[PDB]
């Protein structure tokens, strides 16, 4: 009948859930009490990137540590150079509206997107020397929200239509399709092997997908309300995710659960940034609020405040190498950490 | 080559300055309502290109949104003011306009900009009511007990039964702008239906920015 | 993209004439362009500089506030005024487009070039070696000595090299250490200690027969080394 479908799905929930409860024999908080406390930790701005017109909404740092992009509503794309702080290229977007930014990994591609349903991609690596858009991408119904790129030829994007989409350059049309979310989906990670990405949305849950297999492995619904931000851990089988909540959690893909809930009484905020460091050891969140806090992802302890933001933070990264770190703000100003 | 990469970054930040000028001299705007409302009337985001008094208005329209409303309204806190567009025609959905109404009241980031009111096809709410098959505007009883006010001259030749329906839901678009927020932001309520809506949107467009500029100057 | 440049041939010494170059296929605004003079059989040497913009011009230290060179983006061409006209000036004028920021290859396309005949305390570059026969499928390499260490402390070096093949204006091949230029294979590889700096080939072709041309970027005169010529 029907209601056996229900049924049926209501036992499943509670197999997994039960299955779940077994598996959380103890809380790595008191494996972690014997470990050394990181203690406070103070970074300084070591570069301040002031040249945008507008708020920042995203960022995304390059395989090396010297190249920046940014993103802006002006609708433009401006790649700056860490080191000497000069511009590199200003791409100007057909549409103001954007709201992510990816840099790929070989360096020879960037790619933008938001509320314009299009993933504009540009190659910065031209003969002509000018960036121009290689092509875009309207398979999309709904707003653009996050891109990552797998290779040169593989775009990795999540936007507004409740669905995960990884295209292919050569051919500009998707190759598998994700819709176990039904919110829209927003934030988007990759693997650091590239065989595994996760992502989250607004009903409060975060699934890990497969790339080729195109289909949901693990959910995690932990959280009590809406998330903005997440990201994958440096060896590749864990991740945390911030949350509108102003509360952080941190998830294992081989436990299936919530490991610690990062949260404060202090705090009033949503999480709008989240990455980790080269380590794992410190983990770094962006808050709603006009400043960054810095998390320790074991003991989940307070380590440092980051001000110098006169509006709220809209994006955060972390060099591959971990010798800096690069805090996006609506204030139009890129602040390098270190 | 530090002199050589230095002279590019300065080509480029001039630029940037130069077209970004060009985008303080336009005034950005939103679009917001329901599907029933005649909004396209006054792809993704549809931009429309149009000026008044020497000054270009950007309107952004949104489509392809399904229903939620709650965060893609982020990107618009720099946009100087919205206009909401509610289809009082039909009172079916004039119930569900308002609880958007109430939403984007109180959104976390839309604390401090003002909105812009534009009940549309207010011709076809005075067919309505002059005519039968229309009653308490399928509204709470609370209307019988209202009266029409005296303060505001109505168009002249205007029927009273119709003065008394649009301005009981101007006073509850008062008195739902005004149940929160404060001072910080304030709703103008006005009517369309109309060759006058660029005029129109040109002044509030002013008074905004006026209010703003003395609420910056702290007089 | 596509270089052509027109005006020169045999002319008066001490006359005055323009040197005009039509650049295509690529933003002239956003280009930096370079003038390099090549006497018959002799090696290679900068001429003027003109950055995007027009911000900064820079010339030849022998030819300082002699010569004129001008750009005007919206017509896409490119001038060089011959004020003065000497036994010097003599050379094969080769046209050179580039862009300068982190990850750019400077003086990777040359013009074709036009004939025009007439009727201290800075870094110079040398070779070791003049000329060598290398017989094809073998792998050929050479050394260069730079005057003063080119390792800035940015963390690089700014040594460039290029192949003249004959009838032919030349092309970049290495514009720096440990990565390659575009548009050509990597048999091609560069490395150096800050004193010699050397460049090998893994298995010279046919075609990579020519002469070696080698420039720095510290210091802007930019000297160019004495061309090492190649035999098959």
């Known amino acids: 009948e029907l209601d056996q479908l229900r049924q049926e799905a209501e036992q499943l929930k509670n197999q997994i859930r039960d299955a779940r409860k077994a598996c959380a024999d103890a809380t790595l908080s008191q494996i972690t009490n014997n470990i050394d406390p990181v203690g406070r930790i103070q970074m300084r701005t070591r570069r301040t990137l002031r040249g945008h017109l507008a708020k920042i909404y995203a960022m995304h740092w390059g395989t090396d540590s010297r190249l920046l992009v940014s993103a802006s509503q002006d609708g433009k794309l401006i790649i700056w150079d860490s080191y000497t702080t000069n511009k590199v290229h200003a791409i100007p977007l057909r549409s103001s509206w954007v709201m992510t930014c990816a840099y790929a990994p070989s360096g020879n591609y960037v790619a933008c997107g938001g509320l314009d349903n299009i993933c504009s991609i540009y190659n910065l690596k031209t003969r002509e020397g000018n960036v121009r858009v290689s092509r875009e991408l309207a398979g999309h119904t709904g707003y653009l929200s996050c891109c990552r790129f797998l290779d040169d030829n593989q775009i990795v994007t999540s936007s507004g239509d409740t669905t995960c989409a990884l295209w292919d350059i050569e051919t500009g049309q998707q190759t598998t399709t994700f819709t176990g979310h039904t919110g829209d989906v927003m934030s988007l990670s990759l693997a650091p092997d590239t065989r595994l990405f996760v992502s989250g949305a607004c009903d409060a849950s975060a699934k890990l997908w497969d790339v080729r297999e195109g289909m949901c492995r693990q959910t995690f619904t932990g959280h009590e309300s809406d998330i903005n931000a997440i990201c994958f851990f440096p060896n590749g089988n864990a991740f945390a995710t911030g949350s509108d909540d102003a509360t952080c959690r941190l998830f294992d893909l081989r436990a299936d659960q919530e490991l610690m809930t990062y949260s404060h009484d202090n705090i009033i905020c949503g999480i709008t940034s989240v990455s980790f460091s080269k380590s794992g050891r410190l983990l770094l969140a962006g808050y709603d609020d006009f400043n960054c806090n810095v998390w320790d992802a074991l003991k989940a302890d307070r380590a440092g405040v980051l001000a110098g933001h006169d509006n709220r933070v809209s994006c955060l990264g972390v060099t591959d190498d971990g010798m800096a770190v690069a805090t996006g703000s609506w204030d139009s100003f890129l602040k390098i950490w270190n | 080559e530090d002199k050589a990469a230095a002279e590019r970054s300065k080509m480029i930040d001039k630029n940037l300055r130069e077209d970004g000028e060009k985008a303080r001299r336009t005034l950005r705007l939103l679009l917001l309502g329901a599907d029933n409302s005649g909004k396209s009337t006054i792809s993704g985001i549809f931009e429309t290109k149009f000026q008044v008094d020497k000054v270009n208005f950007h309107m952004f329209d949104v489509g392809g949104q399904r229903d939620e409303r709650r965060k893609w309204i982020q990107c618009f806190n720099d946009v100087t003011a919205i206009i909401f567009v509610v289809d009082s025609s039909d009172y079916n959905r004039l119930q569900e306009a308002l609880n958007d109404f109430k939403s984007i009241w109180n959104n976390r980031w839309l604390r401090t900009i003002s909105v812009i009111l534009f009940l549309n096809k207010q011709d076809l709410l005075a067919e309505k009511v002059l005519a039968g098959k229309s009653k308490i505007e399928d509204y709470f009883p609370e209307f019988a007990r209202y009266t029409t006010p005296e303060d505001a001259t109505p168009e002249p030749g205007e029927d009273p039964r119709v003065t008394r329906a649009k301005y009981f839901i101007r006073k509850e678009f008062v008195d739902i702008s005004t149940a929160s927020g404060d001072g910080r932001h304030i709703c103008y309520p006005h009517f369309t239906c109309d060759t006058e809506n660029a005029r129109r949107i040109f002044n509030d467009c002013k008074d905004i920015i006026l209010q703003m500029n003395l609420r910056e100057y702290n007089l | 993209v596509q270089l052509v440049e027109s005006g020169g041939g045999l002319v008066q010494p001490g006359g005055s004439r323009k040197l005009s170059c039509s650049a295509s296929?690529?933003?002239?605004?956003?280009?930096?362009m370079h003038w390099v003079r090549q006497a018959p059989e002799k090696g290679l040497e900068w001429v003027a500089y003109i950055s995007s913009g027009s911000g900064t011009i820079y010339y030849a230290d022998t030819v300082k506030g002699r010569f004129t060179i001008s750009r005007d983006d919206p017509k896409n061409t490119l001038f060089l005024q011959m004020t003065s006209l000497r036994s010097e000036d003599t050379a094969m004028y080769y046209c050179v487009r580039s862009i300068y920021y982190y990850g750019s290859s400077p003086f990777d396309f040359w013009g074709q070039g036009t004939t025009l005949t007439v009727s201290s305390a800075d870094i110079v570059m040398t070779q070791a070696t003049s000329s060598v026969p290398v017989t094809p499928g073998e792998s050929v390499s050479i050394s260069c000595r730079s005057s003063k260490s080119l390792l800035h402390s940015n963390g690089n070096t700014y040594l460039y090299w290029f192949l003249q093949r004959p009838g032919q204006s030349p092309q970049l091949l290495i514009y720096?250490?440990?990565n390659l230029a575009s548009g050509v294979p990597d048999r091609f590889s560069g490395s150096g200690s800050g004193t010699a700096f050397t460049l090998t080939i893994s298995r010279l072709e046919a075609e990579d027969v020519g002469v070696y041309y080698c420039m720095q970027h510290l210091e802007y005169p930019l000297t160019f080394g004495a061309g090492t010529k190649l035999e098959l």
């Open positions: 296929g690529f933003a002239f605004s956003s280009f930096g």
């Open positions: 720096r250490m440990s």
